[PDB]
Amino acid sequence: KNIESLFDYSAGQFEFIDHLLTMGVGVHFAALIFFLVVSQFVAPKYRIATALSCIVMVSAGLILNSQAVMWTDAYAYVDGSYQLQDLTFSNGYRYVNWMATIPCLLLQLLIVLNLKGKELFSTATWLILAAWGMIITGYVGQLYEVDDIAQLMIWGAVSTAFFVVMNWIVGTKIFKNRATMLGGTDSTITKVFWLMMFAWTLYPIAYLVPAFMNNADGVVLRQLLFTIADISSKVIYGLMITYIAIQQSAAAGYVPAQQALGRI
Template sequence: MSTPYANIESLVSLTDAQFHTGSLILMVSYGAHFAFILYFLWTQKDLAPRYRLVPLLSALVMASAGLSLLREFSFWLETYQWNGSLYVPAEDGTTFSNAFRYGNWTITVPILLTQLPLAFALARPEIRRRAIRMSIPALLMIWTGLVGQFGETGDFTQLNIWGLISTLFFVWLIVEVHGTIRAGKAASPAPLAEFPDKLWWYFLATWGLYPIAYALPQLGMTGDVVVVRQLLFSIADISSKLIYGVILSRYLLRRSALEGYLPAQQALGDVPATGTAGR
């Protein structure tokens, strides 16, 4: 039977080192996302106009994720109080919840997935079709995971059953993503033909961190598990959103240059900057 406190963070006491490590993880996470809003807004100017929507969507993802992580950071500070030797759950009943992450993923994941066919410059009907086909299993994966994570403080039956259901939707998602990446490979210029394959393995490696973090409470309700889970969630968020956005932007910069767009060529140093407007 699960307790009213949905996440183990609300029940576990932390050492001084564990509390401040968790605080630092969350602070770096929201700070990095906010900082890269400016990066994506700035770098999109070097891309051919047809590709500029991709980094602009990355900037939107950074803002949404940053706000969510800032709220998680606030919850973290409010949930614990120092008793002279440990940071213990607050006596006023304030609780920590990872549910806000799932709410944010509901917003950001469909955007991240839509960036793929946009970056590969697929035909507009194909972009719409593939975005929908990827977003449906992604949302079902997120929402079933949300239900499951409310069972992490009990006997883990709810956690595991809904985690398995969520994993089935994840498998469906990666099949759809693989199809989009194969289409993107066929549409990529020859010098960039290897990029989609590398992106595929990057997708598996980074998105694969989420189920590990999801299942981690089964190792025990300890401060180390609490901190490691926040670390895994944050690494996954930064790599699958921020670094993913940078990778797509660099791909589009090279693609723009190959297509003869002068500002992209100048940004890559292929031609000297002369102040001449790009085509």
């Protein structure tokens, strides 16, 4: 049902996608160790924001690892090209994993925005419901990326509505609570918003690849886009969230944070 299943791949195409996914794994698990060691310099009220980055690194790293082994399982070099065997490859499992990872990315934002108690719970709940609506309708949409492009588009339009509404909640909370943030991170959090807008928008672009580039090179393009998007939305984003957590910790008088920023 996926466009990947339609084509044979050159050695070049097949190896590049393998390398993309493998590099993706390495980057996320490398970053994991960074988030782990810096977590001790985060104040208790923000430390879960850095923990969530560890959780996202392993979740994302595992899905990329799984995709890579699925890639090599599904294809074998036969008569001059990589051809589909008995096992299958699908991006569908990325969608399932987003059900977990996207709420994690959203929660760590709310934490460094200094949201607490009732407002934190309510905002998280609405954000997660919006994200889940986006992911599920998109998941259903991509079931038709071969059989019914028109249906892919309509589900994608519904999904985009959830996307836009989710982004509006995010933007509203960010620009409203920006003033509450310490150590100059009121400026930093603004760049985080635009990083999210940029990186997350790469995913619906990948989603539409079967509509504007339905060939093996389009398959490569989609994996390339996912790689850019994953690293930007999880790793670079995580690094900024953690920086913001540490800076606000130091400004709030957390000594290990102050000492850490002092060494650099």
